[PDB]
Amino acid sequence: YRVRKNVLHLTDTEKRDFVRTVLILKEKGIYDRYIAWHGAAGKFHTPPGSDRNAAHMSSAFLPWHREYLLRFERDLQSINPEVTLPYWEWETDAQMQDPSQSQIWSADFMGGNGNPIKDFIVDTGPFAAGRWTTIDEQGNPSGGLKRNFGATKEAPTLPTRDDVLNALKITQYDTPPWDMTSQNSFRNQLEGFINGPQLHNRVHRWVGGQMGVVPTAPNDPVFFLHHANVDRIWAVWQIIHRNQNYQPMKNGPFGQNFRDPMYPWNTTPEDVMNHRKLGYVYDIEL
Amino acid sequence: KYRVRKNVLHLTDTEKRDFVRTVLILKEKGIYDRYIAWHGAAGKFHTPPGSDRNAAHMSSAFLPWHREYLLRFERDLQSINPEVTLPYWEWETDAQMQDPSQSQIWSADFMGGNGNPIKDFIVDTGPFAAGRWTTIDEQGNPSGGLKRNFGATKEAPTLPTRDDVLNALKITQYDTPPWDMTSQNSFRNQLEGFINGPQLHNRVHRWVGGQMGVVPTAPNDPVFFLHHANVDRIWAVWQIIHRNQNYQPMKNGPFGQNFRDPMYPWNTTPEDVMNHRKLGYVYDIEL
Ligand SMILES: [Zn+2]
Numbered sequence: 398y399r400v401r402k403n404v405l406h407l408t409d410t411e412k413r414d415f416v417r418t419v420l421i422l423k424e425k426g427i428y429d430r431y432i433a434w435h436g437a438a439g440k441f442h443t444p445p446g447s448d449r450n451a452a453h454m455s456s457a458f459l460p461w462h463r464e465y466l467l468r469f470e471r472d473l474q475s476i477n478p479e480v481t482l483p484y485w486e487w488e489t490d491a492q493m494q495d496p497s498q499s500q501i502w503s504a505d506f507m508g509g510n511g512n513p514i515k516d517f518i519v520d521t522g523p524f525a526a527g528r529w530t531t532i533d534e535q536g537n538p539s540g541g542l543k544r545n546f547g548a549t550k551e552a553p554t555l556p557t558r559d560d561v562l563n564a565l566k567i568t569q570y571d572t573p574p575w576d577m578t579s580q581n582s583f584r585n586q587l588e589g590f591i592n593g594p595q596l597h598n599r600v601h602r603w604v605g606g607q608m609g610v611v612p613t614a615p616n617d618p619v620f621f622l623h624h625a626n627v628d629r630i631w632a633v634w635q636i637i638h639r640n641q642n643y644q645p646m647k648n649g650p651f652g653q654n655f656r657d658p659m660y661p662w663n664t665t666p667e668d669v670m671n672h673r674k675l676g677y678v679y680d681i682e683l
Numbered sequence: 684k685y686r687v688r689k690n691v692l693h694l695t696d697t698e699k700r701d702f703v704r705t706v707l708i709l710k711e712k713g714i715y716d717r718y719i720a721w722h723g724a725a726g727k728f729h730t731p732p733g734s735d736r737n738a739a740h741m742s743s744a745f746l747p748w749h750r751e752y753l754l755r756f757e758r759d760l761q762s763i764n765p766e767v768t769l770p771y772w773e774w775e776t777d778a779q780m781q782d783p784s785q786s787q788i789w790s791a792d793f794m795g796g797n798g799n800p801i802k803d804f805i806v807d808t809g810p811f812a813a814g815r816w817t818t819i820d821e822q823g824n825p826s827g828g829l830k831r832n833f834g835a836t837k838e839a840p841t842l843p844t845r846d847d848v849l850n851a852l853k854i855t856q857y858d859t860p861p862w863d864m865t866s867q868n869s870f871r872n873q874l875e876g877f878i879n880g881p882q883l884h885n886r887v888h889r890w891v892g893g894q895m896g897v898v899p900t901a902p903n904d905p906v907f908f909l910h911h912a913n914v915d916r917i918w919a920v921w922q923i924i925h926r927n928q929n930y931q932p933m934k935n936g937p938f939g940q941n942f943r944d945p946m947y948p949w950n951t952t953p954e955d956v957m958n959h960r961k962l963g964y965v966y967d968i969e970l
Pocket residue numbers: 448449454455575576577578
């Protein structure tokens with residue numbers, strides 16, 4: 398099936414085609430759908446007055462994003478059928494002396510860190526301001542992609558391989574009360590609220606700029622590379638604990654159970670439980 | 684072309700009780716709120732960004748979008764009770780009344796009455812009265828109870844008429860460029876209510892007041908759906924009268940406004956809902 402590859406193993410040509418396909422999606426008005434859907438789920442609380450939302454801080458975090466990526470990728474392939482979504486393996490970059498030296502940040506791919514004299518506006522790469530129009534929380538143009546690697550003092554480093562390995566050991570998908578306080582929960586740990594920010598959250602913070610905030614995060618195309626890695630880690634977790642399943646199955650908040658629709662779609666967690674049936678694998682499976 | 688949408692005033696007592704019962708179950712289950720959020724979400728999705736248009740309002744997709752919105756809503760009613768369809772509030776008939784607050788739509792067995800002035804204009808009668816029903820703000824958080832204040836503004840002290848509707852139906856083009864509020868000689872713009880407005884659809888929102896008066900919160904009032912069934916019926920009428928005209932723009936409009944563009948927040952295109960009969964429903968008038 399479709400193979401999702403480590404960013405570091407992409408050809409320069411596979412690289413160029415992905416960037417180019419993302420630019421075509423932006424130009425068409427399609428990319429903005431993804432920014433919007435994500436901000437909208439972020440405001441949709443399950444139940445209202447609570448601190449879970451459709452896409453974060455609860456059991457749906459993982460399948461929600463798997464669905465998001467699947468949809469994103471099909472759109473990619475409507476433009477170019479040879480393109481799949483790659484993943485950013487940040488736990489290896491965390492190894493590098495200077496993470497900000499990773500080739501993912503090359504001018505030919507995601508482009509670079511922000512310019513501190515311009516308020517951390519990004520001015521190298523295909524998504525530099527003037528080449529890529531971002532949208533503020535309201536749905537209007539915002540003036541340009543920003544990034545500020547490792548500057549947030551609580552998230553100065555990327556997650557390590559050991560962080561990923563320790564998460565892979567948790568036997569449970571998730572526990573009550575199915576939120577950011579869930580303990581011994583693979584979901585809450587991979588998401589990063591288990592004494593973090595760690596893993597998923599930590600990467601967001603580390604990148605800074607739009608990636609640092611929920612409502613604006615997907616303005617940075619690297620959002621999708623980050624999330625493919627989270628999805629990958631979940632896929633590996635499911636392979637290991639083959640007899641473990643999504644929790645909760647029932648009785649949890651509406652929108653959070655195995656067969657509830659995940660706003661803003663009708664897709665349920667159960668629809669996306671098996672990634673191979675969605676048509677794709679990660680190169681490591683292989 | 685079998686499921687039948689009936690005029691509110693033509694519903695039996697059984698029908699009214701069962702429609703209200705279904706809406707209350709939708710709410711409890713958590714499904715109704717998906718509808719409030721969708722509408723809000725679309726209100727903020729500008730086509731294109733910066734523009735005055737959005738996915739659901741002030742442009743060509745206004746009609747198809749709310750048609751798709753209602754269809755999804757109906758499907759969910761029917762998953763609670765397959766006998767239940769979405770009725771329409773024929774407001775142009777209520778507009779004749781000396782006091783429209785006395786329509787049966789506003790009865791305690793159906794939509795409940797007007798806001799209570801003594802108490803910040805909160806609805807205190809009907810199944811949707813404060814304490815019986817909880818509203819939700821633009822932010823996605825609990826916002827107290829329902830509010831209405833009929834005709835409390837000078838921009839819209841009255842409900843559109845029969846003549847207003849008739850004027851709209853005469854119009855030849857579904858819509859005209861630039862496919863926004865400034866469109867002229869356009870059925871869509873006129874119906875939505877921006878031509879020498881606020882009139883028709885907009886006017887009605889303003890007439891009711893409370894949450895119905897502002898885009899992001901309007902669907903907290905279940906009357907929002909009765910009103911839009913009426914808007915959709917008028918469109919369905921216009922499509923028959925003008926059997927030689929189609930939707931606009933077919934192409935080269937902003938993305939999300941064209942005939943085969945997906946309508947955020949769904950993948951549904953205007954084309955998908957152009958013929959309401961093929962969607963499995965008619966209005967009691969199309970007999
Ligand atoms: Zn939480």
